[PDB]
């Protein structure tokens, strides 16, 4: 068994959306290049479902994209597009379907969430959030979907919402201490970790952890550097922060969170500097 890191698209060195796809193997501690996605995509999302990498939404420098494309872990091909053009949307997996909420279509931010079923190749609309959010994070915790942070066109948000499938509505939970947009969101053990982001004035290195059991927020040792629009994932039980913008330059860094000694250390760096790129973890 081995778990690989995948980084797709984003905003590159040359101040442009990019199509680059990189793979990190921790066993070899080595980076590899994969076939590039068919379209340059910044503000993009990415998920893993049945050994498939899904690149969702984004912004190609001209339009924000309905299109979604897939790679079987190789060749990249398009699948059924979303009902909404979504840039900077939250994406996650639940059961064996893909959930994508929020985003920006070029004129309005979205309360919508939708669901991709691969067995019928379909995107289905579901219940709307209370607040439209772009740059918000999506995660699954105890079989329930959480969407955190973002930006509604007016203020940066500390609001966190949770989805109730039995009613089709979202209910608010205890908000985060710091309003964050472009923060990385992941689930590690019994805590939802939110890393970095932007609070309206400063680029954040702060990290918060929400306890699934107690429903309470805590502050954690902050990352080695400020990161906004940084990827966050869990690989073989360790939390990883991926690239991002440090307030002045794009980042190559990938850093790991050590829970036993409670510290962050940069573990590796990619061949490209990216922010708001899609991140996913795939099991080999």
């Amino acid at each position: 068994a081995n778990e690989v890191l995948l980084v797709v698209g984003g905003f590159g060195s040359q101040q442009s959306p990019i199509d680059v796809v990189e793979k990190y193997d921790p066993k070899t501690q080595e980076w590899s290049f994969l076939p590039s996605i068919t379209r340059k995509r910044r503000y993009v999302a990415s998920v893993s479902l049945h050994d498939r990498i899904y690149v969702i939404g984004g912004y190609d420098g001209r339009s924000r994209l309905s299109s979604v494309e897939c790679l079987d872990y190789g060749v990249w091909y398009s699948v059924a597009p979303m009902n909404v053009r979504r840039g900077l949307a939250g994406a996650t997996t639940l059961g064996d379907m893909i959930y994508v909420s929020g985003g920006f279509d070029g004129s309005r931010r979205h309360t919508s969430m939708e669901r991709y079923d691969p067995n019928i190749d379909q995107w289905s609309m579901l219940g709307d959030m209370q607040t439209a959010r772009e740059g918000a994070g999506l995660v699954v915790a105890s079989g329930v979907i959480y969407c955190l942070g973002g930006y509604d066109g007016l203020n940066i948000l500390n609001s966190v919402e949770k989805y109730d499938p039995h009613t089709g509505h979202w209910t608010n939970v205890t908000p985060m201490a710091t309003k964050r947009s472009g923060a990385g969101v992941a689930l590690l053990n019994d805590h939802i970790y939110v890393v970095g982001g932007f609070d309206g004035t400063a680029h954040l290195s702060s990290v918060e952890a929400y306890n699934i059991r107690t429903d309470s927020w805590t502050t954690v040792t902050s990352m080695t550097t400020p990161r906004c629009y940084v990827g966050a994932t869990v690989l073989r039980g360790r939390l990883y922060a991926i690239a991002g913008y440090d307030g002045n330059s794009l980042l190559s860094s990938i850093e790991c969170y050590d829970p036993i000694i409670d510290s962050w250390e940069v573990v590796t760096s990619m061949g490209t500097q990216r922010c708001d790129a899609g991140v996913c973890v795939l099991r080999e």
Binding site: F11, Q15, G135, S181, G182, G200, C228, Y229, Y245
Partner: peptide, 7 residues
């Protein structure tokens, strides 16, 4: 969106 660089 927040602090994301623009093009």
């Amino acid at each position: 969106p927040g602090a994301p660089p623009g093009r």
